Each structure stands twice: as structure tokens, then as C-alpha cells.
Amino acid sequence: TNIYGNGNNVNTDVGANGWAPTVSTGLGDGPVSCTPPTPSPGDTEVPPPRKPFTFPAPPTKSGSRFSKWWEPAAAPSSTANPQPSLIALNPSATQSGNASILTGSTAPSLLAYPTATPVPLPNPDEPSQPGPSGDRTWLLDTVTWSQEFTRGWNIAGSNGMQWTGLESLIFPVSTDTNWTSTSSPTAYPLPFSFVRAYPDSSWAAMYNTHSMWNCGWRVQVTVNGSQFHAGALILYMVPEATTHAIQTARDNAGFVFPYVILNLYESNTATIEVPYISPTPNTSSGLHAPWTFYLQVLSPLNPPPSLPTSLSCSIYVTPVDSSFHGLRYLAPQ
Amino acid sequence: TLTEDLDAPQDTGNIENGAADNSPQPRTTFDYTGNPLPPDTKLENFFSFYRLLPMGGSGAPSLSFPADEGTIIPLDPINWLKGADVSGIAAMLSCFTYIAADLRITLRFSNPNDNPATMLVAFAPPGATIPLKPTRQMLSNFYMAEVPVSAATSTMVSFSIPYTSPLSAIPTSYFGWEDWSGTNFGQLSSGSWGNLMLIPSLSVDSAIPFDFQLSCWVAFGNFKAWVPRPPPPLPPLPTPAANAERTVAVIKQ
Amino acid sequence: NNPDALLSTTGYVSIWVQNPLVGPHTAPASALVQAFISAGESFNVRLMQNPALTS
């Protein structure tokens, strides 16, 4: 029994073996398959913040392989301990490059997906990464929460892209035409709406002139209601897709993404830690914004009577372990 | 066990953290025991079976291309989702953003007119310029197949296409542009598995050319899917209202 | 006498609102916030001079 019984446990060929001398033989043919390339070295950078930047492959040999014909010879959530309500103290803090955010009560904080291993970069260059500026916590628009929002209202500040903007955005990027309309905006794509409102910041200075960019993102929202308010929020941090394919007026199964309910009962705060998910090592600048941050309402907050109906909140967004590759003339975006 | 317990531990917890705890509570008088997982759940076993894809931008299941003209049959996983049905291969891949597999097509086509015929099926690896009007000589360099089709109808054929994309992972949804200057928003033409261009032929070359009709089954293999998304909506059952609560949860009472 | 001069200052501090007060309608209207300043560790000085306020 050699090279037989492939993709066991099922009556089908699962391509268990990428290649065998046996498959594709003249006598018999199986389905084809593939194997990993190992494009030798390159500044091994892929997902933050595991990127070492040191190239495993020898540098400058440029050996080549085939012999040229013109040369003669060459060579948690566990029920063991339950987090108390916001009455109890339970301190916590989440820092960053310089700015930091204290909190009381219980702060749900998670790391959405575990950090993947590094992979050799296709291009050969040294990435230029800036310590803060371009780190710390940048404050996006402070959005107002209102009582009249029903379930799944997609509340957002002044820096978000409008619903119809999520389709037919146009060129190039911000035209100010899709960002200003009656009733807006549904949500902010993370790469595009961060540069907006922060051209001065170095991260902003970069990502214009550097072409491909690499960043992991972490988003943090802070809502403190009085001990008597009741409500909830969700932070989806949806990976790239049109809203129409992602969610339409339903949001019922939408917990498959990262979520971290705010739940104004026991919590003042929520964070998310997201490694960046994009095809190819580095996305191109000025296009292809991979993460989009939605903020939704599970239950309408009904405030204590005789007190103001509105309630206020802010959103803190920051990069993690940024990098860039390649230079060019400045591009607006 | 022990039956009556004064001190038994509570079932309370917190679901606010992203992680959700699904372990069974140790209730008294209950012996909870794990179960082996039957191997219909794993992806690479579940996607190795053939399913029917919706053809073209819309108007599934079948495509009808008139004779003498080839159809390019785009394999973009982004084109399938457009006009995609609630149930089918179409909407199952909507659960994952990125997929990598060697896509195995089996296509069948039935010629209504009665003469035997031959289709010439070619695979243009992504990306590759598809000739605007294909010719037998030009179409042929790529890769060849000669499908004799029975005169009455229904002649099948299968194929095995390795994973050629340079994207490493092909997106099933892409938010951004393709061309630097141009528009083409919301899709990428270079992430996919080639295109199948196929040019019919008739030796008799009789009048009343007519139109061939086809449909194809597609089953991935050695499958990998990197990040999940929520599955598409399924229309719920109607409320009988005669005797409710038998099925369909009641609420708001 | 030359307060806005180099080596004589460092940057500004500040205290900004972010989320305004909320509370039941029994609770008081306002709450004061008092700010103490005490030199931490490593604070050092030298070179005696008469107190530089009167002068």
C-alpha cells in the first residue's frame, strides 16, 4: 500500500499529498496540487508585532541557478471568577506609545486573533518604521449617542463614510462628496478615515509618500453613564467587505466577527486588538482599506427620567507596529 | 454528584469579552461527557464534494452561448456572490473572506441539434489576456482539451486546476479599487483561477446554427479558509397562529 | 522678568473635559476637582538667589 488511500477518512481525493512520483504517471492520473515556495529571504515581516526585520537568506550572493551558455564553467470568561458590576472598584489601565487610558469598574479587553508567524517579503528593502508619533492613541470624532436609535442603528461621528459611500466611493478617495450628506455617517473604514483629520501626524505624513503600508490596529471606545443608565453597544471591527454583503438591516448573526459588547450595566470601556488581515504581505496605499469599525446598539438606552436623554462618547484608534516599504513623490491619497 | 449540595458552584459568568465560554456546567446528578467528532465537519472533507455554481453575473443555473462564439466563464469568487442565491455553493463561500484551493471543475453541455460536435476548452492562467475574438490557433497555446459531445446530448468532462494566484489568498470580498487610475471598484480581476474560454466547432456546418446550453459543478480540494464572516440569512418559517409555540419561539409576552 | 524665554519654561499642562458628568437627579449639581503639585523623585536645584518673586 504505497501512495494509496489518499485523503483518508473520506471517499474522495483531498489532495493530502502535494506531490508523489506516482501521481501523473503515464499509467494513472490523480488531481494535481501545490507546495510552498520559500522565496528564500527578505526582511521577514508579515503580522505585527512579531516581525523581526532580519533577513534569514544570505544577502548579496545573487547566485542564480541555470548555467548560461556563454560561460565556460561557473558555480477568558471562565465562571471561576465573575467580573463585578460597575459599583465595585477593580482598577485597570491600557497604555500605548505615550498616551494612556485609565479606567474603573470592569473593562472588557480582548485580542481578536492570535498573531500569525512571519513570512519572507517579496521585495528587497528596509522598512522605515516610526516610534510615536504614529503610535500612542489618536482620538477620532466624539460621537453623540441618542435615545431614539433602535436596534442596530450604526452610530458614528463626523469622520465616518456615509452608507452610499460604502458603494461607488469614486476617485480619488476623499472627494468630500461622499462624506457630506443628510444623515451620516454609518461607519469609518479604518485606514481611510484615520488619515483624514490627522494629516499632521507622522503616520499621516507617511502612508502618503511610502506606498505599501503595514499596521495592526486597536480600537477603543469609552462611555461612562451614571449608575442608573441602562444600555449596550457592540464594536464589530468588520474585515473588508461592502456593508451590503457584510450586513443588511439584520445584524442577527453578526457576532462571528470580534465584538466585545460594551454593556453599560457593568462596563465603561471596551478595546479590541486586531492583527491585520489582507492578501499579499502589504496593502497598497491610497486604496484597499482592510478593516472597518462599526459601532451598534443592542438595546436602546432609556435614561433615568427627569435627566437628559442624550449621552456622549468617544472613539480612540491607534496603529500597532507600523511599517512601510518603498518611496515616491507625495500622493494626496 | 452527591445529589443535594449546599455549596455547589454558580453558573454566572461574563459574555462581554469576545471569547464565549461554552463548557457545560457541573450540575448535580448529571454526568456530562464529551463526544467524538464525526468527520463531516472538517472543511477539506466538506468542500471536496461537487456542487452547482451559479453561472455568469446572474441568471443561474445554466448558460447558453450561441455557436461559433466562445464564452469566457469567469472564475472570480467575487463574481459568483453577485446575484448569489441564499442556498448553494454561491452563498457558502460567503462565510470566509479568503480561500485557497485547487479548483476542480466538471462541466457538462447538451447540444439540442443532432450532430456530433467538439468543444475546445482552454484555461488562461491569471492574469492572461483573453483574445477579444478567439481563433483556434490563438486559443490553443494556453492549455487544451477536446471534448467530444454526444449527438443526442449530455456529454461531461472534468478538470483539475492547481492554485495559480499570486495573491496567496483570493478574497471573496474586497473593499478598495483595482486600477490605480481607473474605477473597477469592489473587485479584483487578477485574483481567481484563470478563465475557461471554449470555442464550439461543427464539421457539417449546417444552417440553423442554434445555441449550446451548459452548466458546471465545482468542488475545491485541499481547502483552506483564513477568516470567518457571518453566514447568509435563511428565510424563517411562517407562523401557523392556530397553535403557536409548537415551533417558532414566542416572545414579548 | 522674561517668562516666555528659552530654558525658562517647559510645555503647558491642561485639563480637558471628555465625557461630561452624569448622575441621578438626587446627586449634587457640581463637583470640584483640586490639583496638587509636589516635586517627584529626581527633582534637584542649585545656585542660591534671593526669592525671585518680589524682585
Can you describe this structure?
This is part of a larger assembly, with chains A (333 residues), B (253 residues) and C (55 residues). Chain A is mainly β and 333 residues long. Chain A has helices at 190-195, 202-205, 243-246, and strands at residues 92-94, 101-103, 109-111, 138-139, 144-145, 188-189, 213-222, 234-235, 269-274, 292-293, 295-296, 311-312, 314-324. In chain A, the strands form 5 sheets. A 5-stranded mixed sheet of chain A has the order 3-9-7-13-4, with no helix packed on it. A two-stranded antiparallel sheet of chain A has the order 1-2. The longest helix of chain A is centred in the middle third of the chain and has 6 residues, at 190-195. The radius of gyration of chain A is 25 Å and the shape is globular. Chain B is mostly beta strands and 253 residues long. Chain B has one domain (1-253). In chain B, 7% of the residues lie in helices and 18% in strands. Chain B has helices at residues 43-46, 77-81, 89-92, 136-140, and strands at 51-52, 63-66, 98-100, 104-110, 117-123, 146-149, 170-171, 196-201, 211-219, 224-225. In chain B, strands 1, 2, 4 and 9 form a 4-stranded antiparallel sheet that branches. A 3-stranded antiparallel sheet of chain B has the order 7-3-10, with no helix packed on it. In chain B, strands 6-5-8 form a 3-stranded antiparallel sheet. The longest helix of chain B is centred in the first third of the chain and has 5 residues, at 77-81. Chain C has 55 residues and is mostly loops. Chain C is 0% helix and 0% strand.
